[PDB]
């Protein structure tokens, strides 16, 4: 039953850092 | 720094490095009044010509570097003599 | 409503411009007390006690 909650956890765990780091790489130039 | 004080306090910085530090010379400033009190282990002043003003402005840079023995302006006026 | 659109820098009437007209004019306002202009919002108003100082 927990797997449908876990797949939501892992995709948001990457999306969190991904958008922040993607904005960092666009910002610093 | 004067606007984001609590957000820069949110980290244990090892060094507060401070460029062109003649900007700290006024002990009256909200800058210097804050900048004495950030928690870091060590500091640097990188002055393009330090001091070169009245005694209170020597005191202001000195007390930011080290808090020791700088207890008053009149003892600092004692300390060619 | 067309004056409200002009003053809002527009020329297509939308429910907002009608609401602005109807609530600026006291005669339309008192004719139209029992009615809502759908998606027109409300007339912008700050109380004197809420304004600065």
């Amino acid at each position: 039953l927990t797997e449908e909650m876990l797949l939501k956890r892992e995709e948001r765990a990457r999306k969190r850092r991904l958008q922040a780091a993607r904005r960092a790489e666009e910002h610093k130039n | 720094v004067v606007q984001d004080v609590k957000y820069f306090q949110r980290v244990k910085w090892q060094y507060m490095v401070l460029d062109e530090a003649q900007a700290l010379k006024s002990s009256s400033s909200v800058r210097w009044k804050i900048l004495l009190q950030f928690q870091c282990r060590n500091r640097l002043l990188l002055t393009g010509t330090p001091i070169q003003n009245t005694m209170a402005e020597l005191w202001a840079l000195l007390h930011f570097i080290m808090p020791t023995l700088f207890d008053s302006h009149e003892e600092f006026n004692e300390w060619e003599n | 409503a067309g004056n409200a659109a002009r003053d809002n820098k527009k020329t297509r009437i939308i429910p907002r411009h009608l609401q602005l007209a109807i609530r600026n004019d006291e005669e339309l306002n008192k004719l139209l007390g029992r009615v809502t202009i759908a998606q027109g919002g409300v007339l912008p108003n700050i109380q004197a006690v809420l304004l600065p100082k």
Binding site: - | - | T36, I46, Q47
Partner: protein, 93 residues
């Protein structure tokens, strides 16, 4: 504190959009209706006409409550004020 609340008032009085989320309100309509009759259907526009009337009723309630609160000089609002607004406009007692 309290300066940005005035900027929120200006922003939401300049804008004209729905302040409640559509899907939660769409459920609320159906979830109430299901004991006035079994299994109501709703046309897509009907939930919006309901939501518009409800938000307009709530904005009018807060407007009348603002006059209640500022009459009592308090800038903050409580049920103490809304229970004048309903009782004096006429929906209760």
């Amino acid at each position: 504190p309290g300066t940005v609340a005035l900027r929120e008032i200006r922003r939401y009085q300049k804008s004209t959009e729905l302040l409640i989320r559509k899907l939660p309100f769409q459920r609320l309509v159906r979830e109430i209706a299901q004991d006035f009759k079994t299994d109501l259907r709703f046309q897509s526009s009907a939930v919006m006409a309901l939501q518009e009337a409800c938000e307009a009723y709530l904005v009018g309630l807060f407007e009348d409550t603002n006059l209640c609160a500022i009459h009592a000089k308090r800038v903050t609002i409580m049920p103490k004020d809304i229970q004048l607004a309903r009782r004096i406009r006429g929906e209760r007692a």
